[PDB]
Structures are given as C-alpha cells and as structure tokens.
Design an enzyme around this catalytic site. Structure first.
Site, PDB file in Angstrom:
ATOM      1  N   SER A   1       5.761 -18.444   6.721  1.00 44.65           N
ATOM      2  CA  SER A   1       5.094 -17.954   7.939  1.00 44.65           C
ATOM      3  C   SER A   1       4.092 -18.973   8.515  1.00 44.65           C
ATOM      4  CB  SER A   1       4.392 -16.612   7.676  1.00 44.65           C
ATOM      5  OG  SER A   1       5.226 -15.703   6.981  1.00 44.65           O
TER       6      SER A   1
ATOM      7  N   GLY B   1       5.406 -13.625  10.264  1.00 40.44           N
ATOM      8  CA  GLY B   1       6.762 -13.574   9.740  1.00 40.44           C
ATOM      9  C   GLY B   1       6.998 -12.709   8.516  1.00 40.44           C
ATOM     10  N   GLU B   2       6.310 -13.019   7.418  1.00 44.56           N
ATOM     11  CA  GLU B   2       6.593 -12.364   6.142  1.00 44.56           C
ATOM     12  C   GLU B   2       5.668 -11.200   5.762  1.00 44.56           C
ATOM     13  OE1 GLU B   2       8.027 -15.804   3.311  1.00 44.56           O
ATOM     14  OE2 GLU B   2       6.464 -16.523   4.669  1.00 44.56           O
ATOM     15  N   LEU B   3       4.618 -10.974   6.551  1.00 45.59           N
ATOM     16  CA  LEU B   3       3.691  -9.873   6.293  1.00 45.59           C
ATOM     17  C   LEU B   3       4.362  -8.496   6.151  1.00 45.59           C
ATOM     18  CD1 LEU B   3       0.579  -9.001   6.020  1.00 45.59           C
ATOM     19  CD2 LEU B   3       0.752  -8.477   8.469  1.00 45.59           C
TER      20      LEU B   3
END
Ligand code: FES
Ligand code: FES
Ligand SMILES: [Cl-]
Ligand SMILES: [Cl-]
Ligand SMILES: [Cl-]
Ligand SMILES: [Mg+2]
Ligand SMILES: [Mg+2]
EC number: 1.2.99.7
Length: 907
Positions: free
Chosen positions: A698, A868-870
């Site tokens: 991210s 992105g990855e949260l």
C-alpha cells in the site's frame, strides 16, 4: 461450417462459423469484438455476458448452433462508445464501478438486459439479477455497481435528467478529496481498453502462441523430456525447454535476508532437474494458435521419478523431513521478536492469561482476468515483456540473470490488467515469454486459462499460529507470546519478509510492552507464496484480534471496551518498538460505539431459535511503504500543447494508479491553475519511466504521491515568472529552459527491523481501522450470512473518494471470502471460481459502511496514508468474532465452512 445471417450491435453480419464454436471466440476473434471479456471460460464469472434475443447469456458457453438465423446480439460495443455513452456507462464512471474494469462490459451488458425487462428495479432485484447471471467482480464489492444501475435506471425512466450522470466540479476546482472519475473509466466501460488477451488477438501474424507443459505431480526428479510427437502436430513451430535458456535459468529473490539459510536462487524459469510443485512449467510449445499449442502440449512426454511431497507447513518442518532443495533445510528462515522484559515471569504473575491456536490458509487471489503476458525482440535488439507485473523494475532484476540479459537489454511494461491482488508481486510468466522470444526471435504470447491461474500462480501463504496474552483484571495488556510457521511453497521469493510481518503485526493496535515471539519460514511442495493483499496482516491480526475477544470473554468485558482500553495513545509503541505517527484508534472506537451498541440490540431482538444473529469487532493496522527508507521518483513535464505529463512507474492492478497520479498532481499544481483533464499519466515501462517502485505494501499514494508532489512543486519553480505568474511552454523553450522536471522522495526516518530482536521503524506511515461485522448463523446448516460490514478508516486525507470507497468495499468482500468460503487446498477442486468459494453478489451485503476518521499523516502527501490493504487486515476476524457472538462457537481455522461450523455447534 454454416452461414448465419444475424444482427450484431444493430449491424447485419454475414457470419461463417463452426456450429460447435463458442460465441465468445466468434465475437472476439472473427469479429474483433474484444469488449467481450473472457476470464473463467466456464460460465462462472459473467465477464462474457452478451444479449442474445433479449436474454443475457454467457458467450463462453454458448455454441453457435444455439444462435438462430436472424438472431440479435448486443455486446458492450453496441451499448455505447466513448463519444456516445449509454446511461449505464455514464453511471459506472460516476460511481467508480470500473476499478480494474475487466468485469465492467459484462456487468453493463447484463444490467441492460435487466433494465429492458424490469425498468424500475429495487436494489434487491439488481442483486438477484447479477446473482442469477453470475456477474462476478473481485475489485468493488458490488455496491458501487448496484449504485450505478439504480442511477441509470432513474435516468432511463425519465425521473432524473441525464446531465446528472455527468461529473460536477466542486466549484473551487479542487479534485483532491473529490469523486472525480478515473481517466481510464471511459475505456473500461466501452470495452476499448486492451488487456493482455485482447492485445494477443491484435498482434501480427508470425506471433507465436505459447502453451505450458506442466508437472502433473507435486514433487519429482526429472529424467528427460520427449518432444517428438508434439513437433509433428498442427501449427507447431518448436518446443522450448531449459536447454534454450541463455542465463542461470533461475529467478532470484533479490532481497533475500542474510539469516535466510537459502541463497534465493531456488526458483527455476523452466524446470531442469526437479519438479517442486504441481503445475511447474517444464516446457513451452510454440504454435500458430493457442488452441494448437495447447493440443500439442498435451503430447509432450515428461519422464518423472515421483518423490514424496510435503503438502503443508507442519509436514515439511518436521526434523525427519527430506530437503526439498538439497543443501537447504526446509525451515530456511526464522524471525524472532524480542521486546521489553522476559514474558515467562509476567505470564506467571498476571491476573488473566489466554492462548489460542489459529490457522489462516492458502487464499487464492481469483482475479477475473487469468494471467497473460507477451514478449518480443525489438528493432533495437532489446527484449520487451508486456505483462501484469505490478513491479516492472523489480521483476526486471529478478529475471534478467535468469534469462541471460543485462538490465539495459530487457524492457518490462505493465499492460492494463484485470486485478492481481498481490499475485503479481511475483513474476509468473515474464521469464517464460522472455525465454521464448529470445530462442525463436519471434513475438510470443502466453495466456493462462483459469485452472492454470489457480494452480500455477502464487497464493497467500498459510500460517499455523499460537498467540498468548497476559493482562491485568482491568484489561491492561502486560505481555504477549507468539509462534508462527509460514508455509511458503517451494519458491523463497519474499518468504522471509512475509515472516517478518508476523513480528510487526501480531498484536498490532495495542500498547504491549513485553513480547517474546518466533516466526519460521518453511518450503513445501504446495503452491509457492506470492503476496496477497494484506501480506502477513490477515494471518497475524486474525490470531491477535480473535484472541482479543477471548481475553475479553475471560475478563467479563465488552470486546470493544477492552480494545478502547489498550489502543495506541501518545507514549505507546507498536510491536517493533516504534511510536505510532498518529493516534486515531480511540477516536474511531468512540465514534463506532453507539453503532455497535445499536447492532448488539438489533442482533438480540432479531435472533430466532434457528437463525442466530451476532456482532463482531476487530482492529486493523498496516504499513504504507516497503520496509526501511523506501523511495520513489516522478517526472513532471510541460508538453508543447500546454498539457502536463507525470511520468511514473505506478503500476495499476486496477486500484486507480491513474486517478492517484492525476489527483495528487492536480493538488500540487493548483498555483498554476492546471485543469485535471490536462494532466496525463504513464503506463509503467522500465526504459521510459523512473523507478517509482512496485505497487505493493500500500505504498504508491505515499511514496510516489510524494514524488509526484515534489516533481510538480519543482515544475512550478521552473515555470515561475519573476514578478508573479507562470511562463508558457513556448516561452520556456525559446529561453532554452528545461520543461521536464525530476522529483524524488524518501521515507528518511525509517529503519529496517533488526535480525535478532525484530525491533525498528519499518514504515513512517501506517493505516488504521476498526471493523464491525453483523452476521446471521443458521444453526441447522451452520451457514453464515454476513448482513453488514462497517469500517472506521483513518486514511489521513483522501486523494479520491471513488477510489478509497471502492478499495474498502473490495477488501471487505475479500474478507467475507477469507472468513467463510475461500481456500486453495485441493489442487483440482479449488481450481474454479465456484469450487474455491469465490464470493458472488448475494454473499456480499448491500450494507457496506465506511466512516472516515482522517488524522493527516506528517509524512504523507497532503496528509495521505495508503488504503490498499487496510480493508483486508482483519475483516475476517470481525466476522469470526460475530459468529462467536451469535452462537458461542469460535472457528480457529479458516474458513468457517458450514459443516465445520455445524460440527462446533453440536459438539
Ligand atoms: S462466464 Fe464466460 S468468461 Fe467467465
Ligand atoms: S472492476 Fe470488477 S473485477 Fe475488477
Ligand atoms: Cl500473504
Ligand atoms: Cl476451528
Ligand atoms: Cl461445508
Ligand atoms: Mg500506558
Ligand atoms: Mg462432519
């Protein structure tokens, strides 16, 4: 052969076809309608949705004999074109429904079939329709797509004017923070954006089409390859094996850790001595067509001495295990985490301890578009690769010595792609196409089918985890212990780093002054490990966030309240001993609390004897950046026509690299008053774009966003007129002044985590969130339905709301799959979308709620963190916590299959 005179997109077509031919093939190849997108090729994804005589069908399972004389077909090209958009295409753009955009044509075509039969559908009608017609999306979580259908419907009905589907400027000119459509939206919704497979159909004759000859066992010594029968088969040019490889025939992990017991050159390009996993490429057939190549590939004979295979971490990690890579032990890496005081005595003297054994498995990325690449020798003598690489500079150096080229002699370019969700942090087909292009001298093209996409691209690595918490009666965490074993398959690339993530993220979110833990990486013969969105977090935080609920239950405390007590506050450090950069978790919990109490009340009231409702909470934390002093570079160039190009290698999985570039650049260029439509982005290319870094961790919005901001700031200075105002292009060139300006940025204050203690400051920017899941468990079947998901998100500041909303919705849906349905354990069974438990629309609730609680980041561009990855850090923990709240049963090993839940229910 038969003549079929039909109508395609309002135009009479004189078709000449095999009655047995697929409509998808006919439309795409014979008629050039590449807007008909093909993914699964098995009628399961709806990407190939077309309208045949008023019905929505999947062209990939519709044979031409089912197409009657005088039939009427509509594809995306007939719905509308860039200068003539249909209300459904305008609505998609406005609502940000095209992320990767691979599913967009099918969805829009399908939706048109819906509106032609039900003009004023409810939201449930829309969902029902997309479920029936099997329209799958891996990017958006479906909500924005339904939003778009509803809005288009209003317009077609005459309830709202069409101009309301056009974006309206915020009336100060600020597109940062807005819902400004992404530049690629129009091309995606018209099917005029060419993805890898589309480009392959549009390549010149002479282009060789590749097929892989793959191992059909999991572990073997190779004795020899017999290509004799294949070479006589129709359309076959040649067969390529390891003998044709000009270099080391090895992919390098490139940043292999010193304490790694392996050298990181373990992965072959083409198998030579050994098979390490089922699906390993042993040979490449080059033929005049995909179909002919695949046919001949079936007849290449491989002589194998099958060895016993270790198909899980525990089996391969045993003392008595035979080394998969001789000379290297199967357990090839260990990362300790040593923080504060010895935990042994603190656990002995604490009021409460809890402990748990947890498992998160081999999640398959399941993009709608299966892997595809092509390569060619340019006139300049360089080898060019065009693929789904989301780190072109990275992959260049990973593959160059293997294929036998110097860095200056190979060029990597990112094609438009239909999602990767991390699997393209790894090379998949790049070295294979390079090798084929080099050996033949001809353009080569390689497209995986869905089965190959599942079996022979990387997977999320399974972790077996034991985590422990020691605490005071008031809930104050005192200590933690952790042990994790990472099953990484046979190929080591970034395996050690993934293991390191366990040290950084098990127990993330809370002040925990004392930690003793150990992570271990192990080689197996199951699918090799490639990053999957979250990369270590989904495993780590599943364990620690489920254990937080166990600690709460043991204390007699509300799980949310226990978190409120321990959440990061000024003075605290994260597990690697670093201070959080912002402190937004208490703020997010406080704002969620009433919504959570209200959900508890609803759950109790609406529960029945057969359908039990529950509410689960988790926290999510992840870094924005690669480890240590990460850096990016961008170039801001004023062009002759007065436009500005921002050159980056910001790779677009579909997340919105284009809108991130345009959004960040526009904000930075505001003093010069530059319109957003005048700002151009660049597709990643190792020769013509700077090393902005990979789209992993991210990182891009922070790293490249900063670099873009710096580049744009420097362009302003270069354009600045003495006495106020700005020079034009013509004025600058006449004065022999530069017009292309560099900008760099570095996460200066970051350090790598120590090899002995695990301590350090690996990221300068983190992402923070609080999840709430609302579920119904049917206690007769053990089937869980997720009725609502909430994410409290601190993203610092939003570059673009369409992008961040879409990102979060997308990650939440993948959380539902990870929790309930998704796995790649059985090589054959889990090789389809449906077999592997891909979440179709009805599995994802319409109720997806985001609350932004943004605490501007000191080091972020205009305050931004990544996103992105949260949404995938721990949504599956909240879901599993919700199942426990509903029924009293805890699933420790994902996924929570109905039978598995039933077995626990009846224990
Ligand atoms: S349903 Fe036809 S390509 Fe997936
Ligand atoms: S936008 Fe639907 S699969 Fe990517
Ligand atoms: Cl992962
Ligand atoms: Cl379990
Ligand atoms: Cl089941
Ligand atoms: Mg304290
Ligand atoms: Mg059973």
């Amino acid at each position: 052969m038969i003549q079929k005179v039909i109508t395609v997109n309002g135009i009479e077509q004189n078709l000449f076809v095999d009655a047995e031919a697929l409509l998808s093939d006919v439309l795409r190849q014979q008629l050039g309608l590449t807007g008909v997108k093909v993914g699964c090729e098995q009628g399961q994804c709806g990407a190939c949705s077309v309208i045949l005589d008023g019905k929505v069908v999947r062209a990939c399972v519709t044979k031409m004999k089912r197409v009657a004389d005088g039939a009427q077909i509509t594809t995306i090209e007939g719905v509308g074109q860039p200068e003539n958009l249909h209300p459904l295409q305008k609505a998609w753009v406005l609502h940000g429904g095209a992320q990767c955009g691979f599913c967009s044509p099918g969805f829009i075509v399908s939706a048109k079939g819906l509106l032609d039969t039900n003009a004023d559908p409810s939201r449930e009608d829309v969902r029902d329709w997309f479920q029936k017609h099997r329209n799958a999306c891996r990017c958006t979580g479906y909500k924005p797509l339904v939003d778009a259908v509803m809005d288009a419907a209003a317009v077609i009905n005459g309830k709202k004017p069409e101009t309301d589907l056009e974006f309206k400027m915020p009336a100060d000119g600020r597109i940062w923070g807005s819902k400004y459509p992404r530049p690629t939206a129009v091309a995606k919704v018209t099917g005029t954006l060419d993805y890898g497979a589309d480009l392959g159909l549009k390549m010149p004759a002479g282009t060789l089409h590749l097929a892989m000859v793959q191992a059909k066992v999991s572990h073997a010594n190779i004795k020899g390859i017999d290509t004799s029968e294949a070479l006589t088969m129709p359309g076959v040019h040649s067969v390529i094996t390891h003998k044709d490889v000009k270099g080391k025939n090895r992919i390098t992990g490139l940043i292999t850790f010193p304490t790694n017991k392996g050298d990181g050159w373990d992965r072959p390009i083409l198998c030579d001595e050994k098979v390490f996993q089922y699906g390993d490429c042993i040979a490449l057939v080059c033929a005049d067509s995909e179909a002919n190549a695949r046919a001949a590939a079936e007849k290449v004979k491989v002589d194998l001495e099958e060895l016993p295979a270790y198909m899980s971490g525990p089996a391969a990690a045993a003392e008595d295990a035979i080394e998969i890579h001789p000379g290297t032990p199967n357990v090839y890496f260990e990362q300790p985490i040593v923080k504060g005081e010895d935990t042994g005595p603190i656990f002995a003297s604490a009021d409460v301890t809890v402990e748990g054994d947890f498992y998160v498995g081999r999640q398959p990325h399941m993009p709608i578009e299966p892997d595809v690449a092509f390569a060619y020798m340019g006139d300049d003598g360089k080898c060019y690769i065009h693929s789904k690489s989301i780190g072109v500079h990275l992959h260049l150096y990973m593959i160059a010595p293997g294929v036998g080229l110097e860095p200056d002699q190979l060029v990597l370019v990112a094609n438009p792609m239909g999602g990767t969700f991390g699997y393209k942090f790894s090379p998949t087909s790049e070295a294979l196409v390079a090798v084929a292009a080099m050996a033949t001298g001809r353009p080569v093209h390689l497209r995986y089918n869905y089965q190959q996409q599942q079996q022979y691209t990387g997977k999320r690595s399974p972790w077996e985890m034991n985590v422990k918490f020691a605490a005071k009666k008031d809930g104050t965490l005192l200590a933690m212990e952790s042990d994790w074993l990472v099953d990484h398959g046979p190929y080591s690339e970034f395996g050690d780093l993934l293991t390191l993530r366990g040290a950084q993220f098990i127990g993330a979110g809370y002040n925990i002054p004392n930690i003793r833990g150990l992570g271990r990486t192990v080689a197996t013969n199951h699918v090799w490990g490639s990053a999957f969105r979250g990369y270590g977090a989904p495993q780590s935080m599943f364990a620690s966030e489920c254990l937080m609920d166990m600690l709460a239950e043991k204390l007699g405390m509300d799980p949310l309240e226990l978190r409120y007590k321990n959440a990061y506050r000024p003075g605290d450090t994260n597990p690697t001993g670093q201070e959080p950069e912002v402190f937004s978790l208490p703020d997010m919990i406080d704002q969620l609390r009433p919504k959570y109490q209200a959900a508890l009340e609803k759950a109790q009231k609406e529960s029945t004897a057969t359908h039990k409702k529950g509410v689960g909470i988790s926290i999510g934390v992840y870094g924005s950046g690669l480890d240590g002093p990460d850096a990016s570079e961008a170039w801001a160039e004023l062009n002759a026509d007065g436009t500005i190009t921002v050159h980056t290698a910001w790779e677009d999985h579909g997340q919105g690299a284009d809108i991130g570039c345009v959004g960040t650049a526009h904000e930075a260029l505001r003093p010069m008053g530059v319109a957003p439509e005048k700002i151009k982005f660049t597709w990643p290319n190792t020769a013509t774009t700077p090393n902005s870094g990979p789209s992993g961790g991210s990182r891009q919005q922070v790293m490249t966003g900063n670099a873009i901001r710096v580049a744009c700031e420097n362009l302003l200075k270069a354009c600045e007129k003495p006495g106020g105002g700005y020079y034009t292009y013509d004025e600058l060139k006449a004065a022999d002044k530069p017009t292309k300006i560099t900008g760099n940025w570095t996460a200066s204050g970051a350090t790598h985590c120590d090899a002995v203690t695990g301590l350090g400051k690996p990221f300068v920017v983190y992402m923070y969130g609080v999840f709430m899941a609302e579920v119904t468990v049917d206690v007769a079947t053990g089937q869980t339905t997720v009725d609502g998901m909430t994410l409290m998100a601190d993203l610092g500041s939003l570059c673009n709301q369409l992008a961040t909303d879409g990102q979060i919705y997308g990650g939440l849906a993948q959380g539902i799959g990870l929790a309930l349905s998704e796995d790649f354990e059985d090589i054959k069974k889990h090789a389809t979308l449906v077999g592997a438990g891909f979440p179709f629309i009805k599995q994802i609730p319409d109720k997806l709620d985001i609350v932004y609680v943004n605490h501007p980041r000191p080091d972020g561009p205009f305050g931004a963190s990544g996103v992105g990855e949260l949404p995938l850090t721990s949504p599956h923990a909240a879901i599993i916590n919700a199942i426990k709240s509903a029924t009293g049963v805890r699933i420790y090993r994902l996924p929570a299959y109905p039978e598995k839940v039933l077995e626990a229910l009846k224990a």
